């Protein structure tokens, strides 16, 4: 049962997983349709409307779950191992989440709370006309930066400047992406 399996997968994803999944889908689901998505099922329904998810096409859902490190869900509900995922996503042209989006997600995955406060302060420095919200996570900050075109595939100067002021492993994730 396809719909039931989607429902069960959705029952195992909380608000934080959902925020991550929404960020990783940003290039296919725009902000107006992102806003009312409060549970994973609504995200899945939007993906079904684009035919990016159907009984015969599980690739994007598998890639999403892999990128947020839900290997438990991959094996339990989609009969898929980490190694199959790795070899599939290393085949050129098969990954549907861009390397840039994944890179940003991995940065946000290694920034702690205090490091988030340093990030927010440095970016408020770059944004001297708008007081940022205080509840923002790093993914929200990335979205705000993209809106101002101070962050993008061809613009990592401010990201690098801020990350270098915080931790060298962040600059490493960035440089590996560039390579």
């Amino acid at each position: 049962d396809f719909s039931r399996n989607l429902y069960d997968i959705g029952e195992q994803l909380d608000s934080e997983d959902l925020a991550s999944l929404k960020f990783l889908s940003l290039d296919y689901i725009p902000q107006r349709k992102q806003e009312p998505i409060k549970d994973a099922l609504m995200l899945f329904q939007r993906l079904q409307e684009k035919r990016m998810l159907e009984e015969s096409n599980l690739s994007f859902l598998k890639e999403l779950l892999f990128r947020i490190n839900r290997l438990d869900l991959l094996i339990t509900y989609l009969n898929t191992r980490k190694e199959e995922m790795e070899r599939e996503l290393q085949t050129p042209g098969r990954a549907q989440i861009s390397a840039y989006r994944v890179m940003l997600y991995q940065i946000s995955e290694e920034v702690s709370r205090s490091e988030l406060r340093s990030f927010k302060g440095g970016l408020q420095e770059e944004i001297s006309k708008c007081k940022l919200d205080d509840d923002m996570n790093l993914l929200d900050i990335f979205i705000e930066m993209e809106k101002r075109v101070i962050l993008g595939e061809g613009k990592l100067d401010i990201l690098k400047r801020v990350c270098a002021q915080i931790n060298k492993s962040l600059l490493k994730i960035i440089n590996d992406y560039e390579e």
């Binding site: 725009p30 902000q31 349709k33 409307e49 684009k50 708008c130 809106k147 101002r148 075109v149």
Partner: protein
């Protein structure tokens, strides 16, 4: 094609999708103002603007590919082939306005309407209305047009949506 297919399409779309559909066809049906999507699709059919490919274009523009397959038995390959080989029902200007609208959340649209109230009466447009509703009011006032996007660019800049200003500039460069 038939009245049953039109009825299926009309039953399957939600309110936002129907409003977008009415907005996207404002240049096709200009001598009549269709009150709803059923009347719009009927008029487009009568005037020869609703072949299967035309309806597929409309469904493609509202991004309902599930409906493309279920009702018209097509995918993106065939719809893109049709769009390459035929004139488009929906202009690139209309597509651009819908794309901008889909990238704006409720707070951004509210800020935009507030900025546009310096150009129109407070009763023209309610606070909760959509970006496409605002665009319609601006078109009626001749404040936005395919060759007149400077005010829209200024307003998007003022709400710090430089990404959307960039989309507009890319559109202008395409011309």
């Amino acid at each position: 094609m038939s009245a049953e297919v039109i009825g299926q399409v009309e039953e399957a779309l939600d309110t936002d999708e129907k409003e977008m559909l009415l907005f996207l066809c404002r240049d096709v049906a200009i001598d009549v103002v269709p009150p709803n999507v059923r009347d719009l699709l009927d008029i487009l059919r009568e005037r020869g603007k609703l072949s299967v490919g035309d309806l597929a274009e409309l469904l493609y523009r509202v991004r309902r590919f599930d409906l493309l397959k279920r009702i018209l038995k097509m995918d993106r390959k065939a719809v893109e082939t049709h769009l390459l080989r035929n004139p488009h029902l929906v202009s690139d200007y209309r597509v651009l306005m819908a794309e901008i609208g889909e990238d704006l959340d409720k707070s951004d649209v509210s800020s935009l309407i507030f900025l546009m109230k310096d150009y129109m009466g407070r009763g023209k447009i309610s606070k909760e209305k959509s970006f496409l509703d605002l665009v319609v009011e601006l078109e009626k006032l001749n404040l936005v047009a395919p060759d007149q996007l400077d005010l829209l660019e200024k307003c998007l800049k003022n709400i710090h949506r430089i990404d959307l200003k960039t989309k507009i500039q890319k559109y202008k460069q395409s011309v």
